[PDB]
Amino acid sequence: SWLTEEDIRRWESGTFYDSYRKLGAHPDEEGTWFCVWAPHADAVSVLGAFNNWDPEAHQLERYGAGLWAGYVPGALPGHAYKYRIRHGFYQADKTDPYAFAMEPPTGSPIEGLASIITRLDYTWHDDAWMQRRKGPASLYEPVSIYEVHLGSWRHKQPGVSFSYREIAEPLADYVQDLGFTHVELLPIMEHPYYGSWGYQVVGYYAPTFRYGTPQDLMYLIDYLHQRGIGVILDWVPSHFAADPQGLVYFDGTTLFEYDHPDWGTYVFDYNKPGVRNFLISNALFWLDYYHVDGLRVDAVASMLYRRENLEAIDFIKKFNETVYLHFPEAITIAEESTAWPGVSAPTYNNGLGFLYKWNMGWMHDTLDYMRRDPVHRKYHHDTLTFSLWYAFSEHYILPLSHDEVVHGKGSLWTKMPGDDWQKAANLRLLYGHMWGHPGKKLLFMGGEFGQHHEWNHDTQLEWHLLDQPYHRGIQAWVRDLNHLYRTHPALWHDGPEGFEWIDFNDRDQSVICYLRKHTDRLLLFVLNFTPVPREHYRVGVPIGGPWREVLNSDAVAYGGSGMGNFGRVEAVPESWHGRPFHLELTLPPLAILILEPES
């Protein structure tokens, strides 16, 4: 009896969310237990070195709910194995969907990827971090996400990436100095084509071999946690990879497939309980076995539609419901490119049950506005100001992801208009406004230097640009912005109550003044979107008295001209912007001023 009768009963229910405990390959010192789901199979057999790859040596026995199981003495960790499933006249060799590790036998993932028997034994030293993780409580705490593709981040030599362990100290070193709150990792699950960035997934339960063993990854997360950094894993429940030995036609017929235009026939059949187990158990698998703090679901709209797909909608709702039940302090983030309501809302209120939504609306408006020249920004003022009508519809994360710096879209730097100074000024201004705008922050690697080139995964980021002034200044600006974020709670509350307008109708001079509030604390943000310094510019404020200049984008330390109020600004009790007191300031070129009352 390998499988409990409760397990088979739970499998038929679609309630087996620990299903990884029994499905796949589970090592024992004498031999490995094998468990695979193949309901439309006449037979299933394990092939490996442990039986001369002979199909009649070890035929699993069929249990309930199309669950096949068998024991193989001498099947050992690190050995490659394979399932042979027979559908009537035809038989085929398949990979394990629940494989915990895979490696290419030829040496090339594109030729062969092979399931390898693995033990996940690892002793964690991240005790302290997880007793204090937040997440749902992070709605009122600073969340600043550094989005990363591990292979592309840094190289030991050209074309050779860092191991999971080797990356740990450099990424943890870099992320801490930057002040970032989390790292979001582009999908780590095993994928054949490196150029996929990981979104075509074959081994949902296996971290990719390219960076090391599964424990190597657990150590990385363990390490980062000790350093106080969170780990978000991009996850792909929307579609699986088109690999013939993969999930496609597993038992000889449709199984994980429907019995989408983006990926037709690679869409998961959320109707089947067996599919639902596989997907949700895997979500928990990462939160359980790898202590992951958050999971990000991409192209959620592709699941919602085909007009709405209710199979998927109930699945998403149950996914979010299940995660927070087993891990009350996890975080789930969604990217949904339609105006689907209540993504970030709880299922009990007819929401999808996510904690966070990428504000892709904001990103489009923001980028479109700053692609424009300051001379012309006059005519597009509403694109800038109107982001706040939709800024509280969900619990949002402001997003500047890899998808924006690929396929000829241009690096964030490349997008900004004018000569190099204005390009650097524009990006420092952009981030300043993004850090001020309500919502958490996500920046994809290389945006912190404002690197010239589009993200090229086949190479390492242009760190050499960190030697030159303009790019080193932007890195300093992001670090300093991140310091302001964590220090001041006025930015922690992305609620409507947190934000108040100071002035939004200066279209001619292309300026924005706004307030970000929590209780006592106020933070005043004044933005000049034209390369013209503004003098005697008055900005209304609630409080009188001494005001300080907390940050100036135009500081020479950032590559700025250096026009500034430099603190020591005294409010004048003359009504401005419908406010009791006013500040008389100097607005630097293409810059953001951040000011708070002196205390």
- What residues are labeled active site? 298, 335
Within 312-371, the residues that bind a second copy by CB under 8 A are none
* Of 584, 566, 586, nearest in space to 574 by CA: 584
Q: Which of 22, 79, 84, 272 binds a second copy (CB under 8 A)?
A: 79
Give the up-direction half-sphere exposure of residue 301: CA atoms within 13 A in the CB hemisphere.
12
- The answer to whether residue 174 forms part of the interface with a second copy (CB under 8 A) is no
Rounded distance between C-alpha atoms, residue 121 and residue 520, angstroms: 49
Q: Which of 49, 128, 310, 556 binds a second copy (CB under 8 A)?
A: 49
- The answer to whether residue 434 forms part of the interface with a second copy (CB under 8 A) is no
- Which residue lies nearer to a second copy by CB, 78 or 264? 78
Q: Which of 6, 9, 42, 106 binds a second copy (CB under 8 A)?
A: 106
The helix (H) or strand (E) run that includes residue 274 is helix 273-289
- The answer to whether residue 107 forms part of the interface with a second copy (CB under 8 A) is yes
Q: Which of 74, 88, 328, 562 binds a second copy (CB under 8 A)?
A: 74
Rounded distance between C-alpha atoms, residue 168 and residue 181, angstroms: 15
Q: Which stretch binds a second copy (CB under 8 A): 78-86, 127-135, 139-147, 266-274?
A: 78-86
The helix (H) or strand (E) run that includes residue 284 is helix 273-289
* Of 230, 590, 304, nearest in space to 427 by CA: 590
SS (H, E, C) 68-136: EEEEEECCCCCCEEEEEEEECCEEEEECCCCCCCEECCCCCCCCCCEEECCCCCCCCCCHHHHCCCCCH
Q: Which stretch binds a second copy (CB under 8 A): 101-109, 177-185, 286-294, 297-305?
A: 101-109
- The answer to whether residue 55 forms part of the interface with a second copy (CB under 8 A) is no
CB-based contact 512:429 (threshold 8 Å)? no
The helix (H) or strand (E) run that includes residue 500 is strand 499-503
- In whole angstroms, the minimum distance from the beta carbon of 105 to a second copy comes to 7
Report how many residues bind a second copy under the rule CB under 8 A. Answer: 13
- Which residue lies nearer to a second copy by CB, 48 or 361? 48
Question: In 10 A of CB 69, how many CB atoms?
Answer: 18
Q: Which of 39, 55, 77, 136 binds a second copy (CB under 8 A)?
A: 77
- 3-state secondary structure at position 37: strand
Site string for a second copy, 437-476 (x = CB under 8 A): ----------------------------------------
List the beta strands (DSSP E) in 401-489: 440-444
- Which residue lies nearer to a second copy by CB, 118 or 426? 118
- The answer to whether residue 80 forms part of the interface with a second copy (CB under 8 A) is yes
- Which residue lies nearer to a second copy by CB, 212 or 450? 212
CA-based end-to-end distance of the chain? 70
- In whole angstroms, the minimum distance from the beta carbon of 142 to a second copy comes to 39
Bridge partners (DSSP) listed for residue 535: 586
Fill in the amino acid letter for 147.
E
Give the phi and the psi of residue 322 in degrees, each rounded to 5: -70, -45
Question: In 10 A of CB 409, how many CB atoms?
Answer: 14
Q: Which of 76, 92, 242, 466 binds a second copy (CB under 8 A)?
A: 76
Q: Which of 16, 33, 34, 50 binds a second copy (CB under 8 A)?
A: 50
Q: Which two tokens mark 438?
A: 């309500």
Query: For residue 173, with 0-12 CB atoms within 10 Å meaning exposed, 13-18 middle and 19 or more buried, which class applies?
Result: exposed
- The answer to whether residue 265 forms part of the interface with a second copy (CB under 8 A) is no
- 3-state secondary structure at position 531: coil
- Which residue lies nearer to a second copy by CB, 57 or 92? 57
Q: Which stretch binds a second copy (CB under 8 A): 44-52, 350-358, 473-481, 517-525?
A: 44-52
Bridge partners (DSSP) listed for residue 538: 584
- In whole angstroms, the minimum distance from the beta carbon of 418 to a second copy comes to 52
- In whole angstroms, the minimum distance from the beta carbon of 79 to a second copy comes to 6
Q: Which of 9, 42, 78, 264 binds a second copy (CB under 8 A)?
A: 78
CB-based contact 571:581 (threshold 8 Å)? yes
| CB-based contacts of 460, cutoff 8 Å, min separation 6 | 152, 153, 154, 155, 158
- In whole angstroms, the minimum distance from the beta carbon of 6 to a second copy comes to 32
Q: Which two tokens mark 299?
A: 């192209």
- Which residue lies nearer to a second copy by CB, 78 or 545? 78
Q: Give me the sign of the Cα torsion angle 295, 142, 335, 395.
A: positive
| CB-based contacts of 439, cutoff 8 Å, min separation 6 | 359, 362, 391, 396, 397, 398, 494
- In whole angstroms, the minimum distance from the beta carbon of 104 to a second copy comes to 9
- Which residue lies nearer to a second copy by CB, 78 or 88? 78
Q: Which stretch binds a second copy (CB under 8 A): 102-110, 410-418, 427-435, 540-548?
A: 102-110
Fill in the amino acid letter for 488.
H
- Which residue lies nearer to a second copy by CB, 74 or 264? 74
Binding site for a second copy (CB under 8 A): 49-50, 52, 74, 76-80, 103, 105-107
